[PDB]
CSV table of C-alpha atoms and ligand atoms in Angstrom, one decimal:
chain,number,residue,atom,x,y,z
A,1,UNK,CA,-21.1,18.3,-0.5
A,2,UNK,CA,-18.9,15.0,-1.5
A,3,UNK,CA,-19.5,11.6,0.0
A,4,UNK,CA,-16.6,9.0,0.0
A,5,UNK,CA,-16.3,5.2,-0.1
A,6,UNK,CA,-12.9,3.5,1.1
A,7,UNK,CA,-12.9,0.1,-0.4
A,8,UNK,CA,-10.2,-1.4,2.2
A,9,UNK,CA,-10.3,1.2,4.9
A,10,UNK,CA,-8.3,-1.0,7.3
A,11,UNK,CA,-5.4,-0.9,4.7
A,12,UNK,CA,-2.5,1.0,4.6
A,13,UNK,CA,-3.7,3.5,2.4
A,14,UNK,CA,-7.2,3.2,3.1
A,15,UNK,CA,-6.4,4.2,6.7
A,16,UNK,CA,-4.9,7.2,5.6
A,17,UNK,CA,-7.8,8.0,3.6
A,18,UNK,CA,-10.1,7.5,6.3
A,19,UNK,CA,-7.8,10.0,8.7
A,20,UNK,CA,-7.5,12.5,6.2
A,21,UNK,CA,-10.7,12.6,4.2
A,22,UNK,CA,-12.8,13.9,7.2
A,23,UNK,CA,-10.3,16.6,7.8
A,24,UNK,CA,-11.6,20.3,7.9
A,25,UNK,CA,-8.9,21.7,5.2
A,26,UNK,CA,-9.1,18.7,3.0
A,27,UNK,CA,-10.1,19.5,-0.5
A,28,UNK,CA,-14.0,19.3,-1.3
A,29,UNK,CA,-14.6,19.0,2.4
A,30,UNK,CA,-16.3,18.2,4.5
A,31,UNK,CA,-16.4,14.6,3.6
A,32,UNK,CA,-19.1,11.8,4.6
A,33,UNK,CA,-16.9,8.8,4.5
A,34,UNK,CA,-17.7,4.9,4.1
A,35,UNK,CA,-15.3,2.5,4.9
A,36,UNK,CA,-15.6,-1.0,3.4
A,37,UNK,CA,-13.7,-4.4,4.7
A,38,UNK,CA,-14.4,-7.6,6.2
A,39,UNK,CA,-12.8,-7.7,9.7
A,40,UNK,CA,-14.4,-5.9,12.4
A,41,UNK,CA,-13.3,-2.3,13.5
A,42,UNK,CA,-10.1,-2.4,15.1
A,43,UNK,CA,-8.5,-0.4,17.7
A,44,UNK,CA,-6.5,2.1,15.6
A,45,UNK,CA,-9.3,2.7,13.3
A,46,UNK,CA,-12.0,3.7,16.2
A,47,UNK,CA,-11.4,7.5,16.6
A,48,UNK,CA,-12.2,8.4,12.9
A,49,UNK,CA,-15.8,9.7,11.9
A,50,UNK,CA,-16.2,6.8,9.6
A,51,UNK,CA,-19.2,4.8,8.7
A,52,UNK,CA,-17.7,1.5,8.7
A,53,UNK,CA,-19.2,-1.5,6.6
A,54,UNK,CA,-18.3,-5.2,6.9
A,55,UNK,CA,-18.3,-6.7,3.4
A,56,UNK,CA,-16.6,-9.3,1.5
A,57,UNK,CA,-16.2,-7.8,-1.9
A,58,UNK,CA,-15.6,-11.2,-3.4
A,59,UNK,CA,-19.1,-12.3,-2.8
A,60,UNK,CA,-21.4,-10.5,-5.3
A,61,UNK,CA,-24.3,-11.0,-2.9
A,62,UNK,CA,-22.7,-9.4,0.3
A,63,UNK,CA,-21.8,-6.8,-2.2
A,64,UNK,CA,-25.2,-6.0,-3.4
A,65,UNK,CA,-26.6,-6.4,0.2
A,66,UNK,CA,-24.0,-4.2,2.0
A,67,UNK,CA,-23.6,-1.3,-0.8
A,68,UNK,CA,-26.7,-0.9,-2.5
A,69,UNK,CA,-28.4,1.1,0.2
A,70,UNK,CA,-25.4,3.4,-0.2
A,71,UNK,CA,-27.1,6.3,-2.4
A,72,UNK,CA,-24.9,9.3,-1.7
A,73,UNK,CA,-21.5,8.2,-2.8
A,74,UNK,CA,-19.9,10.9,-4.9
A,75,UNK,CA,-16.3,9.4,-4.9
A,76,UNK,CA,-15.0,5.7,-4.8
A,77,UNK,CA,-11.3,4.8,-3.5
A,78,UNK,CA,-10.4,1.3,-4.4
A,79,UNK,CA,-7.6,0.4,-2.2
A,80,UNK,CA,-7.6,-3.4,-1.6
A,81,UNK,CA,-6.2,-6.3,-3.2
A,82,UNK,CA,-6.0,-10.3,-3.0
A,83,UNK,CA,-2.8,-12.4,-3.3
A,84,UNK,CA,-2.9,-15.7,-4.8
A,85,UNK,CA,-0.3,-18.5,-5.9
A,86,UNK,CA,0.1,-17.3,-9.7
A,87,UNK,CA,-0.6,-14.1,-11.4
A,88,UNK,CA,-3.4,-15.7,-13.3
A,89,UNK,CA,-5.4,-16.5,-10.2
A,90,UNK,CA,-4.8,-13.0,-9.1
A,91,UNK,CA,-6.2,-11.5,-12.4
A,92,UNK,CA,-9.2,-13.6,-11.7
A,93,UNK,CA,-9.7,-12.7,-8.0
A,94,UNK,CA,-9.0,-8.9,-8.2
A,95,UNK,CA,-11.1,-8.4,-11.5
A,96,UNK,CA,-14.2,-10.2,-9.9
A,97,UNK,CA,-13.5,-8.0,-6.7
A,98,UNK,CA,-13.4,-4.7,-8.5
A,99,UNK,CA,-16.3,-5.8,-10.8
A,100,UNK,CA,-18.8,-6.9,-7.6
A,101,UNK,CA,-18.3,-3.3,-6.3
A,102,UNK,CA,-18.6,-1.4,-9.6
A,103,UNK,CA,-21.7,-3.3,-10.7
A,104,UNK,CA,-23.4,-2.0,-7.5
A,105,UNK,CA,-22.3,1.3,-7.3
A,106,UNK,CA,-22.5,2.8,-10.6
A,107,UNK,CA,-26.3,2.1,-11.2
A,108,UNK,CA,-27.5,2.8,-7.4
A,109,UNK,CA,-25.4,6.1,-6.8
A,110,UNK,CA,-27.0,9.1,-8.9
A,111,UNK,CA,-24.0,11.4,-7.9
A,112,UNK,CA,-21.1,9.2,-8.8
A,113,UNK,CA,-18.3,11.5,-10.0
A,114,UNK,CA,-15.2,9.6,-9.9
A,115,UNK,CA,-13.7,6.0,-9.1
A,116,UNK,CA,-10.0,6.1,-8.3
A,117,UNK,CA,-8.2,2.6,-8.4
A,118,UNK,CA,-4.7,1.8,-6.6
A,119,UNK,CA,-2.3,-0.5,-8.1
A,120,UNK,CA,1.4,-0.3,-7.9
A,121,UNK,CA,4.9,-0.1,-9.3
A,122,UNK,CA,4.6,-3.7,-10.4
A,123,UNK,CA,2.5,-2.5,-13.3
A,124,UNK,CA,6.1,-1.9,-15.0
A,125,UNK,CA,8.4,-4.7,-13.4
A,126,UNK,CA,5.7,-7.5,-13.5
A,127,UNK,CA,4.1,-10.0,-11.2
A,128,UNK,CA,6.1,-11.1,-8.1
A,129,UNK,CA,7.3,-14.5,-9.7
A,130,UNK,CA,8.5,-12.7,-12.7
A,131,UNK,CA,10.6,-9.8,-11.2
A,132,UNK,CA,14.2,-9.4,-12.2
A,133,UNK,CA,13.4,-12.2,-14.5
A,134,UNK,CA,11.8,-10.5,-17.6
A,135,UNK,CA,13.1,-7.2,-19.9
A,136,UNK,CA,11.1,-4.2,-18.5
A,137,UNK,CA,11.1,-0.7,-19.6
A,138,UNK,CA,14.2,1.1,-18.9
A,139,UNK,CA,13.5,3.1,-15.7
A,140,UNK,CA,12.4,5.7,-14.5
A,141,UNK,CA,9.1,4.4,-15.3
A,142,UNK,CA,6.5,6.6,-17.1
A,143,UNK,CA,3.0,6.0,-17.1
A,144,UNK,CA,2.0,5.9,-20.5
A,145,UNK,CA,4.4,3.3,-22.1
A,146,UNK,CA,3.2,0.0,-23.3
A,147,UNK,CA,2.1,-2.8,-20.9
A,148,UNK,CA,4.5,-5.8,-20.4
A,149,UNK,CA,3.3,-9.1,-22.7
A,150,UNK,CA,2.6,-10.9,-19.5
A,151,UNK,CA,-0.5,-11.3,-17.2
A,152,UNK,CA,-0.8,-8.7,-14.7
A,153,UNK,CA,-4.0,-7.9,-12.3
A,154,UNK,CA,-3.3,-4.5,-12.7
A,155,UNK,CA,-3.7,-4.7,-16.3
A,156,UNK,CA,-7.0,-6.7,-15.8
A,157,UNK,CA,-8.3,-4.1,-13.5
A,158,UNK,CA,-7.3,-1.3,-15.6
A,159,UNK,CA,-9.4,-2.8,-18.5
A,160,UNK,CA,-12.4,-3.5,-16.3
A,161,UNK,CA,-12.6,-0.2,-14.9
A,162,UNK,CA,-12.4,1.6,-18.4
A,163,UNK,CA,-15.5,-0.6,-19.4
A,164,UNK,CA,-17.3,-0.1,-16.3
A,165,UNK,CA,-17.4,3.9,-16.0
A,166,UNK,CA,-18.5,4.0,-19.5
A,167,UNK,CA,-22.0,3.0,-18.2
A,168,UNK,CA,-22.4,6.5,-16.9
A,169,UNK,CA,-22.2,9.8,-18.7
A,170,UNK,CA,-19.4,12.2,-16.9
A,171,UNK,CA,-18.3,9.1,-15.0
A,172,UNK,CA,-14.3,9.7,-14.6
A,173,UNK,CA,-11.6,7.6,-13.2
A,174,UNK,CA,-8.0,7.5,-12.4
A,175,UNK,CA,-5.3,5.1,-11.2
A,176,UNK,CA,-2.4,5.5,-9.0
A,177,UNK,CA,0.8,3.5,-9.0
A,178,UNK,CA,2.8,3.8,-5.8
A,179,UNK,CA,6.0,2.2,-4.9
A,180,UNK,CA,6.9,0.5,-1.7
A,181,UNK,CA,4.4,2.1,0.6
A,182,UNK,CA,5.7,3.4,3.8
A,183,UNK,CA,2.5,3.7,6.2
A,184,UNK,CA,0.9,2.5,9.3
A,185,UNK,CA,-1.5,-0.9,9.3
A,186,UNK,CA,-0.9,-3.6,11.3
A,187,UNK,CA,-3.9,-5.3,9.1
A,188,UNK,CA,-1.7,-4.8,5.8
A,189,UNK,CA,-0.4,-7.5,3.6
A,190,UNK,CA,2.8,-5.3,2.6
A,191,UNK,CA,3.4,-3.3,5.4
A,192,UNK,CA,7.4,-3.0,5.1
A,193,UNK,CA,7.9,-0.4,7.9
A,194,UNK,CA,5.9,-2.4,10.4
A,195,UNK,CA,7.7,-5.5,9.5
A,196,UNK,CA,11.3,-3.9,10.0
A,197,UNK,CA,10.1,-2.4,13.1
A,198,UNK,CA,9.3,-6.1,14.7
A,199,UNK,CA,12.5,-7.2,13.5
A,200,UNK,CA,14.3,-4.4,15.1
A,201,UNK,CA,12.5,-5.1,18.4
A,202,UNK,CA,13.4,-8.7,18.4
A,203,UNK,CA,17.0,-7.8,17.5
A,204,UNK,CA,17.1,-5.4,20.6
A,205,UNK,CA,15.4,-7.7,22.9
A,206,UNK,CA,18.1,-10.6,22.2
A,207,UNK,CA,21.0,-8.4,22.1
A,208,UNK,CA,21.7,-9.5,18.4
A,209,UNK,CA,22.9,-7.2,15.8
A,210,UNK,CA,20.4,-5.8,13.3
A,211,UNK,CA,21.5,-7.3,10.2
A,212,UNK,CA,20.5,-6.6,6.8
A,213,UNK,CA,18.4,-9.1,5.1
A,214,UNK,CA,18.7,-8.1,1.4
A,215,UNK,CA,21.1,-7.7,-1.4
A,216,UNK,CA,23.5,-5.4,-2.0
A,217,UNK,CA,21.7,-3.4,-4.9
A,218,UNK,CA,18.9,-2.7,-1.9
A,219,UNK,CA,21.6,-1.9,0.4
A,220,UNK,CA,23.8,0.2,-1.5
A,221,UNK,CA,21.9,1.4,-4.7
A,222,UNK,CA,19.0,4.0,-4.9
A,223,UNK,CA,15.9,3.3,-3.5
A,224,UNK,CA,12.5,5.4,-3.6
A,225,UNK,CA,9.1,4.8,-1.4
A,226,UNK,CA,5.6,6.0,-1.4
A,227,UNK,CA,4.3,7.7,1.9
A,228,UNK,CA,0.8,6.3,2.5
A,229,UNK,CA,-0.5,10.0,3.9
A,230,UNK,CA,1.0,11.2,0.3
A,231,UNK,CA,-0.7,8.4,-1.6
A,232,UNK,CA,-4.2,9.6,0.0
A,233,UNK,CA,-3.7,13.0,-0.8
A,234,UNK,CA,-3.0,11.9,-4.4
A,235,UNK,CA,-6.3,10.0,-4.5
A,236,UNK,CA,-8.0,13.0,-3.1
A,237,UNK,CA,-6.2,15.4,-5.7
A,238,UNK,CA,-7.3,13.4,-8.7
A,239,UNK,CA,-10.7,12.6,-7.1
A,240,UNK,CA,-11.5,16.8,-7.1
A,241,UNK,CA,-9.2,18.1,-9.7
A,242,UNK,CA,-10.8,17.9,-13.2
A,243,UNK,CA,-7.4,18.2,-15.3
A,244,UNK,CA,-6.5,14.9,-13.8
A,245,UNK,CA,-9.5,12.8,-15.0
A,246,UNK,CA,-9.3,9.7,-17.0
A,247,UNK,CA,-5.4,9.6,-16.2
A,248,UNK,CA,-2.9,7.3,-14.5
A,249,UNK,CA,-0.5,8.6,-12.3
A,250,UNK,CA,2.9,7.5,-10.4
A,251,UNK,CA,2.9,8.4,-6.6
A,252,UNK,CA,6.2,8.4,-4.8
A,253,UNK,CA,7.6,10.7,-2.3
A,254,UNK,CA,9.8,12.5,-4.8
A,255,UNK,CA,13.2,11.8,-3.1
A,256,UNK,CA,15.5,8.7,-3.1
A,257,UNK,CA,17.5,7.2,-0.4
A,258,UNK,CA,19.7,4.0,0.3
A,259,UNK,CA,18.8,1.3,2.9
A,260,UNK,CA,22.3,1.7,3.9
A,261,UNK,CA,21.4,5.1,5.7
A,262,UNK,CA,18.0,4.1,6.5
A,263,UNK,CA,19.2,1.0,8.4
A,264,UNK,CA,21.2,3.3,10.8
A,265,UNK,CA,17.9,5.4,11.3
A,266,UNK,CA,16.1,2.1,12.0
A,267,UNK,CA,19.1,0.9,14.4
A,268,UNK,CA,18.8,4.2,16.3
A,269,UNK,CA,15.1,4.3,16.9
A,270,UNK,CA,15.2,1.0,18.6
A,271,UNK,CA,18.5,1.0,20.4
A,272,UNK,CA,20.2,-1.9,18.2
A,273,UNK,CA,23.5,-1.9,17.0
A,274,UNK,CA,23.6,-1.3,13.4
A,275,UNK,CA,24.9,-4.4,11.4
A,276,UNK,CA,26.2,-3.9,8.0
A,277,UNK,CA,25.4,-5.6,4.6
A,278,UNK,CA,27.6,-9.0,4.8
A,279,UNK,CA,28.6,-10.3,1.4
A,280,UNK,CA,27.7,-13.9,0.1
A,281,UNK,CA,25.2,-14.2,2.8
A,282,UNK,CA,21.5,-13.6,1.5
A,283,UNK,CA,19.7,-13.5,4.9
A,284,UNK,CA,15.7,-13.8,4.8
A,285,UNK,CA,13.7,-12.9,7.6
A,286,UNK,CA,11.1,-15.1,6.8
A,287,UNK,CA,13.9,-18.0,7.7
A,288,UNK,CA,15.6,-15.8,10.3
A,289,UNK,CA,12.4,-15.2,12.3
A,290,UNK,CA,11.1,-18.9,11.8
A,291,UNK,CA,9.6,-19.9,15.5
A,292,UNK,CA,9.9,-16.5,17.4
A,293,UNK,CA,6.4,-16.1,18.2
A,294,UNK,CA,7.4,-16.7,22.1
A,295,UNK,CA,9.9,-13.9,22.0
A,296,UNK,CA,7.5,-11.5,20.4
A,297,UNK,CA,4.8,-12.5,23.2
A,298,UNK,CA,7.8,-11.7,25.7
A,299,UNK,CA,8.2,-8.4,24.0
A,300,UNK,CA,4.6,-7.2,24.1
A,301,UNK,CA,4.4,-8.3,27.6
A,302,UNK,CA,7.5,-6.6,28.8
A,303,UNK,CA,6.8,-3.4,27.1
A,304,UNK,CA,3.1,-3.3,27.6
A,305,UNK,CA,2.3,-3.4,23.8
A,306,UNK,CA,-1.1,-3.9,22.3
A,307,UNK,CA,-1.9,-7.8,21.9
A,308,UNK,CA,-0.6,-8.6,18.7
A,309,UNK,CA,0.2,-11.9,17.0
A,310,UNK,CA,3.8,-12.1,15.0
A,311,UNK,CA,1.9,-13.1,11.8
A,312,UNK,CA,-0.4,-10.2,12.0
A,313,UNK,CA,2.3,-7.7,12.5
A,314,UNK,CA,5.1,-8.8,10.4
A,315,UNK,CA,4.8,-9.9,6.5
A,316,UNK,CA,8.6,-11.5,6.5
A,317,UNK,CA,8.1,-12.5,3.0
A,318,UNK,CA,7.4,-9.2,1.8
A,319,UNK,CA,10.1,-7.7,3.6
A,320,UNK,CA,12.4,-10.2,2.0
A,321,UNK,CA,10.8,-9.8,-1.5
A,322,UNK,CA,11.6,-6.0,-1.2
A,323,UNK,CA,15.1,-6.2,-0.1
A,324,UNK,CA,16.3,-9.0,-2.0
A,325,UNK,CA,16.1,-7.0,-5.4
A,326,UNK,CA,17.1,-3.6,-6.7
A,327,UNK,CA,14.9,-0.7,-7.0
A,328,UNK,CA,14.1,0.7,-10.2
A,329,UNK,CA,12.8,4.2,-10.1
A,330,UNK,CA,9.7,6.0,-11.3
A,331,UNK,CA,9.0,9.3,-12.4
A,332,UNK,CA,6.6,12.0,-10.9
A,333,UNK,CA,6.6,14.5,-14.0
A,334,UNK,CA,3.2,13.6,-15.2
A,335,UNK,CA,1.7,14.2,-12.0
A,336,UNK,CA,3.8,17.4,-11.4
A,337,UNK,CA,2.6,18.6,-15.0
A,338,UNK,CA,-0.8,17.9,-14.0
A,339,UNK,CA,-0.6,20.3,-10.8
A,340,UNK,CA,0.1,17.6,-8.2
A,341,UNK,CA,3.1,19.1,-6.2
A,342,UNK,CA,3.0,16.9,-3.1
A,343,UNK,CA,5.8,15.4,-1.8
A,344,UNK,CA,7.5,13.8,1.2
A,345,UNK,CA,11.1,13.5,2.9
A,346,UNK,CA,11.6,9.9,2.7
A,347,UNK,CA,13.8,9.8,5.9
A,348,UNK,CA,11.2,11.9,8.1
A,349,UNK,CA,8.4,9.7,6.7
A,350,UNK,CA,10.4,6.8,7.8
A,351,UNK,CA,11.0,8.0,11.4
A,352,UNK,CA,7.4,9.3,11.4
A,353,UNK,CA,5.7,5.9,10.4
A,354,UNK,CA,8.1,4.3,13.0
A,355,UNK,CA,6.9,6.4,15.6
A,356,UNK,CA,3.2,6.1,14.9
A,357,UNK,CA,3.7,2.0,15.4
A,358,UNK,CA,5.3,2.8,18.5
A,359,UNK,CA,2.5,5.4,19.2
A,360,UNK,CA,-0.1,2.9,18.6
A,361,UNK,CA,1.7,0.4,21.1
A,362,UNK,CA,2.3,-2.1,18.1
A,363,UNK,CA,6.2,-2.1,18.6
A,364,UNK,CA,8.3,-0.8,21.5
B,401,NAD,N1,1.2,-2.4,0.3
B,401,NAD,C1,2.2,-2.1,-0.4
B,401,NAD,O1,3.5,-1.7,-0.1
B,401,NAD,C2,1.9,-1.8,-1.7
B,401,NAD,C3,2.9,-1.0,-2.6
B,401,NAD,C4,2.6,-0.7,-3.9
B,401,NAD,C5,1.4,-1.2,-4.3
B,401,NAD,N2,0.3,-1.7,-3.5
B,401,NAD,C6,-0.9,-1.9,-4.2
B,401,NAD,O2,-2.0,-1.3,-3.4
B,401,NAD,C7,-3.1,-1.6,-3.5
B,401,NAD,C8,-3.7,-2.2,-2.3
B,401,NAD,O3,-2.7,-2.5,-1.5
B,401,NAD,P1,-2.8,-2.1,0.4
B,401,NAD,O4,-1.3,-2.7,0.7
B,401,NAD,O5,-3.1,-0.8,0.3
B,401,NAD,O6,-3.9,-3.0,1.1
B,401,NAD,P2,-3.7,-3.4,2.4
B,401,NAD,O7,-3.2,-4.8,2.3
B,401,NAD,O8,-2.8,-2.6,2.9
B,401,NAD,O9,-5.2,-3.6,2.8
B,401,NAD,C9,-6.1,-3.8,2.2
B,401,NAD,C10,-7.6,-3.2,2.6
B,401,NAD,O10,-8.7,-4.0,2.2
B,401,NAD,C11,-9.4,-4.8,3.0
B,401,NAD,N3,-9.8,-6.0,2.4
B,401,NAD,C12,-8.9,-7.3,2.2
B,401,NAD,N4,-9.5,-8.1,1.4
B,401,NAD,C13,-10.7,-7.6,1.4
B,401,NAD,C14,-11.9,-8.8,0.8
B,401,NAD,N5,-12.0,-9.4,0.3
B,401,NAD,N6,-13.1,-7.6,0.8
B,401,NAD,C15,-13.1,-6.4,1.3
B,401,NAD,N7,-11.8,-6.0,1.7
B,401,NAD,C16,-11.0,-6.4,2.0
B,401,NAD,C17,-8.3,-5.2,4.2
B,401,NAD,O11,-9.3,-5.4,5.4
B,401,NAD,C18,-7.6,-4.2,4.4
B,401,NAD,O12,-8.5,-3.2,5.4
B,401,NAD,C19,-3.0,-3.0,-4.1
B,401,NAD,O13,-3.4,-3.4,-5.6
B,401,NAD,C20,-1.4,-3.2,-4.2
B,401,NAD,O14,-0.9,-4.1,-5.2
B,401,NAD,C21,0.8,-1.9,-2.1
B,402,STR,C1,13.9,-1.0,-2.8
B,402,STR,C2,13.0,-2.3,-3.5
B,402,STR,O1,13.8,-3.2,-3.4
B,402,STR,C3,11.9,-2.0,-4.1
B,402,STR,C4,11.8,-0.8,-5.1
B,402,STR,C5,10.8,-1.1,-6.4
B,402,STR,C6,9.8,-2.2,-5.7
B,402,STR,C7,9.3,-3.4,-6.5
B,402,STR,C8,8.5,-2.6,-7.4
B,402,STR,C9,6.9,-1.9,-7.0
B,402,STR,C10,6.4,-3.2,-5.9
B,402,STR,C11,5.3,-3.0,-5.7
B,402,STR,C12,4.4,-4.0,-5.1
B,402,STR,O2,3.5,-3.8,-4.5
B,402,STR,C13,5.1,-5.8,-4.8
B,402,STR,C14,6.3,-5.4,-4.5
B,402,STR,C15,7.1,-4.4,-5.7
B,402,STR,C16,7.5,-5.3,-6.6
B,402,STR,C17,8.3,-3.9,-5.2
B,402,STR,C18,9.1,-4.8,-4.5
B,402,STR,C19,10.6,-4.1,-3.7
B,402,STR,C20,11.1,-3.1,-5.0
B,402,STR,C21,12.2,-3.9,-5.8
């Protein structure tokens, strides 16, 4: 039987992996699940049969401390990251985080079969600062085209992973590059759905219109996204399928959409009146929601929500970052040609993840 390690279990995809791995019908199930994180176990992670572990993977001592006793690990799911001012600092911080984990697991786990590493569609468009500013390859992005000639901590992590798996015969790897992730995790540093839900709940409480905080290309152009549960199934599939070993795969829901339509979905789900894209405005939730923490705590008590601080639940800079730029699509041909036929209805996923945030009483 298989034993999984989820590096970043309170994450947006780690929480999906924590919910799906111990399922009875999950491939290679039953699954024993260790889940690594720093914070204490929150309230939306409590009803899963997961063996929680508190550890800062940037500290090589706590990583040797907490992970050396773990003997039975068969598969590893690295699904965390760290943000810094420049991309060079992200290469250093995230390379060391992945290295500390692998230095421990590979020798101290005799049955280690697979390591799956989650990167992203930034692999193709470049780091945050350079996005829209550098000549990329032409979309839709395919997995095995040359890397951009710029720094990128996805590149740094991939090279590291390739060297580390060599230290064990029959050790095998996979990397998964999702688009914007539709999922549920209040602790996530990039939870787009949760951020858009809070902005809709604040527009509702104030009687103001849900205005689009982005550009016309995100409003009127084609967009796609990656469902968190679908990314989890994508990890598990590559972890257990030997015809997907040592390969990089995109993972997106399989359909496109326009935030023009999704806005009315978001508007319908919170009772707000849908606003349209206003030209020559360039509205930023980071600016628009400045100093609105009292309004949030007013919403929380008036709707019996869970005790949440606006900063944790809404990452305005991320939301602004995604809606201010056009959406270049990726291709799911390589995954489908290797036998992964999973998919999601992006509209239904959006509603589904909105309703999960409502269900856990994070938004009204
Ligand atoms: N969030 C997104 O929308 C998004 C979309 C595309 C690709 N990505 C890529 O997915 C990968 C993972 O992102 P995410 O968004 O799933 O993560 P996340 O922010 O949603 O959650 C990360 C998880 O790891 C844990 N954690 C963070 N710091 C830690 C540390 N120092 N030590 C141990 N654990 C730690 C957190 O507690 C959290 O549980 C990243 O490389 C990201 O580039 C994310
Ligand atoms: C709808 C949209 O604007 C999305 C589609 C492709 C997405 C970008 C490319 C993929 C992506 C992944 C990340 O983890 C950081 C933000 C970026 C860089 C995304 C920001 C928002 C974009 C541009």
